[PDB]
Design a protein around this nucleic acid. Structure first.
Ligand SMILES: [Zn+2]
Ligand SMILES: [Zn+2]
Ligand SMILES: [Zn+2]
Ligand SMILES: [Zn+2]
Lengths: 107, 101, 95, 83, 101, 93, 97, 82, 107, 93
DNA sequence: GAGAATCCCGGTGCCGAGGCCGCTCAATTGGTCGTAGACAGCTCTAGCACCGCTTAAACGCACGTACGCGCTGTCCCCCGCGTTTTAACCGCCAAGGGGATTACTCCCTAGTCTCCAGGCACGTGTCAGATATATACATCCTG
DNA sequence: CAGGATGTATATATCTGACACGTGCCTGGAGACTAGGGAGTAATCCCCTTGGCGGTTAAAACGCGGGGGACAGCGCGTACGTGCGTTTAAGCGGTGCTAGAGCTGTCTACGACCAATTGAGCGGCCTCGGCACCGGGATTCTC
């Protein structure tokens, strides 16, 4: 019969089959359920979609058509939940958010 | 914009409460799916189920009253759209309170 | 002639809106090699490895300086002092 | 030739630039020496972990993968260089 | 707490819906305060509702407002972390489409 | 030797959300690192859950619990919803 | 009558509570607080005695560490009194805020 | 019932005792309220993780194992309970 | 075949066999070598020996004969390397170190 | 059923170090938790090393490198010495 | 020196720590078999060392100024303590909810084989943007 | 308050090197089928958790006098920001060697797996000594 990808079957862009292989060969468990890779691929796809949407919005604000590490850093650090998820994560070429303590402001 | 005149029956599906079948009185919205009902209707339904009556989305884990909010904008919207709604509701309120102190 | 503080604020805005590395590449590479000489002799370093080390160093130092500035502000000052850095590291758990 | 006093290559203007990126308005004179010491300690730790990884890898070069792995080990996980 | 029904609300009868075919008229300024975006001061488009306060905005307006300004509501100053604190409201989308096509 | 990465999938998601916006090589590498990190975190939590419950298999329930444990609040809620729809669509075939 | 100057009894309490090792929060109020907080997640929940004991031990250890950091902040600010600003500084530097 | 208004279970002498064990000589008046808020947040997080573990276990009793696992996830691993 | 335990063969008190079984069933790798459990058991035995020695010294400096969590906490936090190893570790019924900042004391 | 632990081995080590000193139940639980935590740390480190170098085996070299990565300074040095001595004693006997 | 806190010494009791016994299940021993990787060999690439030119940036110095560091004064707010009250705690009881155990079976995933197309390395045209220059606008400082 | 000086975002023009798209292919993903063990389901035991009741206080709550510390204002002088000329070496670009990263073939020793077995380790029980608590002096700290 015609070969149909599991990603297309589950309506996902992420590689469900590759995720299943990585789970199996990743020494995570003796056995891996059939529905396990689909859920993980969906979660990864949603997280990627959120971060890419925020970074693209930042790029559009900066009048740029290319997502850069600065836009990724702005997207991650301007979101409280994403910042908590990536609290220990350092993004290369991302810089820091513009933030000056009010006491340092001129009086 | 110009003056608009539209039929009420075309607006009934978006101003009626599913649980009671009537118009939105003291509209209350569950925020996990943004579904609006009458305050009494949703509150009374919530002691027997923790799921949304319409789309069966779990409103809350334990206390569904923690995820319902008063929909003031929609409530004044249904008052403006439905003629006589506010006066009729106040009339029943005063009539009920005219006999019980 | 600008008053003190205005140029400092301008530099703060400029270096906060930019993402380039702030430590000189060759001195940082030489420092990395000197430090690594104590662990294994005749080591080689990838350019990407040195760049990653530098990015980590700048990020850690910028976070430490943010915490130090918060300590200085807490102490009712706008000047950072070494005891601010020491307090920040002690609270973080690095000392 | 064993390198010596290369920490002096971490210049006072560079430390000031890092502080400015950190939002510091005024910097004292001892901050430069304290920051040099702190950076030396941090680099010593990270490079020690990376060199240990390289030695286990039966290799004579420290790679960006080893640096990233050491940073992830120390809770300072770094993106952009693989992993 | 703050949800116990009053004596009247214990037994209030449903509002009978107007089933007869009569049309209602609305001026272009009738529902201004209810269908106006606090940001763009125009009619809503792709409505998003904050969970904590039930306040209505256009999608683009609220996204740029959160992305640029502070993470608080433009109307009631209550904090919202990100776009996931809001949900689209197809009911308001339908209402807008039928009222002002 | 081929070095697999999530580059094409992240690009497809980017084309889905922002059709006219491209990406840089550094941004692709950062996103690949993020995907790998989230993958290993979720997989490790699922493995720990299965070990604690004396279960030898990683299931959608374990993945859902790991997602709920790690992602905070609204991110966890939306990720759980998306995984539920994906699993339902995959099994309804 | 005899009256100790301020600070002496405080230092004595510091010494006695730093030498001693029993739990400082009351068992029943802490258990009721734990149950009230857990009411939001699940219903008709049960707790083992060891579970609430572990919760109390962890909470007291966390609060003691936070108070040590807060005292360090207060001393750094040239003060002896802890303050909410000190607590907020300690938490922000630790990364909890 | 509801089990409402129990956060005040932590008394001012209890917070003072914790501060004394922490080496604090002098305590401000709002320290008690701030500590109550911080403890409430910490307990909310830890108990949320523990209840998630219990629910995944298909049980109804929060166990010392669940609490220990939650604390270990939070980076606050606790010894003495298994 | 006179059966000789692996722990006695390696001169260790710790259960080499139990460590090997945990290495198999711990889902760490597809296969586990032969010397790895012995090495891990030796490391665990050394750490236990150091901790118990320091705790016994602390108890003898207290004039008691039974090691308690207070003594264990004192030993852990008084050894710098052990404290660094267990920095994020909370010992139940351990208490805190007797110390007061100098500014808090009169002079 | 049976719940295995390191109580007897911790007691043997305690009798080896301090013949006249005993231990309490809470202290034994503390020691069991410590041994389990260190075991899981070293094993996870060795597993990560083996995956990193595309190796399917955990050997004494992997355990040694894991110990060197985790334990600080003198503790790491003495742990490596003890592990090496045990390994050579095993291969000799 | 008066008074409160705490250490040192001696009795008493109690409860759990440690030792002993019985069982059982998993660690040992022995053997086989499959393959992970150790080792040797080869390739090619990118890391190191050196050179020279340009100019970006660091160094050193002068100078002013504003801010950190005492110093004082006040006032208000925690501390210490006595009295009242209140509910925590200990001991005991009782019911049953569900955690844990055992048995049965069923269906779901590891495993293998064959087939084929999805993605990866590679190549190339092209345009997004780093750069350059000029200009008008926003900040700042001093007279 | 205004005018000069300076920094900065806006408006065009370059040209380019990294990015998006076309293509060969090959290795990993997909379809089919088997089997055997993990897990779901049902029944049962009793552990332990929830709930309550009665004293007994230990401890919490409240109030009051006040002393000391937080806060604010003040002054000074020194250390740091700012600017400028000079000197240093970083950055760029090209060259050349080669140590070592990476890939490949072989075959070998090492680890998984299975059977029999037996002894270490766990569950249960018992007793006696260490420690908590008691009270009385004696020392120490405080005011
Ligand atoms: Zn209704
Ligand atoms: Zn709904
Ligand atoms: Zn709008
Ligand atoms: Zn609002």
């Amino acid at each position: 019969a015609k070969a149909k990808t599991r990603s297309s079957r589950a309506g996902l862009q992420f590689p469900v089959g590759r995720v299943h292989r990585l789970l199996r060969k990743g020494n995570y468990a003796e056995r891996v359920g059939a529905g396990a890779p689909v859920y993980l691929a969906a979660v990864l796809e949603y997280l990627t979609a959120e971060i890419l949407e925020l970074a693209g919005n930042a790029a559009r604000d900066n009048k740029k058509t290319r997502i850069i590490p600065r836009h990724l850093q702005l997207a991650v650090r301007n979101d409280e939940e994403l910042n908590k998820l990536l609290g220990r994560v350092t993004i290369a070429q991302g810089g820091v958010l513009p933030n000056i303590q009010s006491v340092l402001l001129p009086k | 914009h110009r003056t608009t005149r539209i039929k009420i029956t075309e607006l009934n599906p978006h101003l009626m409460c599913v649980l009671c079948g009537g118009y939105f009185i003291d509209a209350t919205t569950i925020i996990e799916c943004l579904h609006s009902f009458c305050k009494t209707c949703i509150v009374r339904y919530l002691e027997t189920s923790k799921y949304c009556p319409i789309c069966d989305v779990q409103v809350h884990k334990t206390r569904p009253l923690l995820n319902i909010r008063s929909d003031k904008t929609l409530q004044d919207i249904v008052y403006k759209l439905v003629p006589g709604l506010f006066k009729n509701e106040m009339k029943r309120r005063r009539d009920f309170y005219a006999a019980h102190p | 002639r600008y008053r003190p503080g205005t140029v400092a604020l301008r530099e703060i805005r400029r270096y906060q809106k930019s993402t380039e590395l702030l430590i000189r590449k060759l001195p940082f590479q030489r420092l990395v090699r000197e430090i690594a000489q104590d662990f294994k002799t005749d080591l080689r370093f990838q350019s990407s490895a040195v760049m990653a080390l530098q990015e980590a160093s700048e990020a850690y130092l910028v976070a430490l300086f943010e915490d130090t500035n918060l300590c200085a502000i807490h102490a009712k000052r706008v000047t950072i002092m070494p005891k601010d850095i020491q307090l920040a590291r002690r609270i973080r758990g690095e000392r | 030739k064993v390198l010596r006093d290369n920490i002096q290559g971490i210049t006072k203007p560079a430390i000031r630039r890092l502080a400015r990126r950190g939002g510091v308005k005024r910097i004292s004179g001892l901050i430069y020496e304290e920051t040099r010491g702190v950076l030396k300690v941090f680099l010593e730790n990270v490079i020690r972990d990376a060199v240990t990884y390289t030695e286990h890898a039966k290799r004579k070069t420290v790679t960006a993968m080893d640096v990233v792995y050491a940073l992830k080990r120390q809770g300072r996980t770094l993106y952009g260089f693989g992993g | 707490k703050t949800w116990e029904l009053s004596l009247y609300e214990l037994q209030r009868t449903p509002q009978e819906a107007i089933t007869d075919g009569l049309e209602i008229v609305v001026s272009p300024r009738s529902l201004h305060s209810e269908l106006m975006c606090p940001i763009c001061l125009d009619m809503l488009k792709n409505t998003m509702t904050t969970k904590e306060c039930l306040h209505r905005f256009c999608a683009d307006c609220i996204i740029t407002a959160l992305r640029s300004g502070n993470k608080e509501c433009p109307t009631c100053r209550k904090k919202l972390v990100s776009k996931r604190s809001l949900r689209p409201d197809p009911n308001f989308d339908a209402l807008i489409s039928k009222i002002y096509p | 030797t081929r070095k697999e990465s999530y580059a094409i999938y992240v690009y497809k998601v980017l084309k889905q959300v922002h059709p006219d916006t491209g990406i840089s090589s550094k941004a692709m590498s950062i996103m690949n690192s993020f995907v790998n990190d989230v993958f290993e975190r979720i997989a490790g939590e699922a493995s720990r859950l299965a070990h604690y419950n004396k279960r030898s298999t990683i299931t959608s329930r374990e993945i859902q619990t790991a997602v709920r444990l790690l992602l905070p609040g609204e991110l966890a809620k939306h990720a759980v919803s998306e995984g539920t729809k994906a699993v339902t669509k995959y099994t309804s075939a």
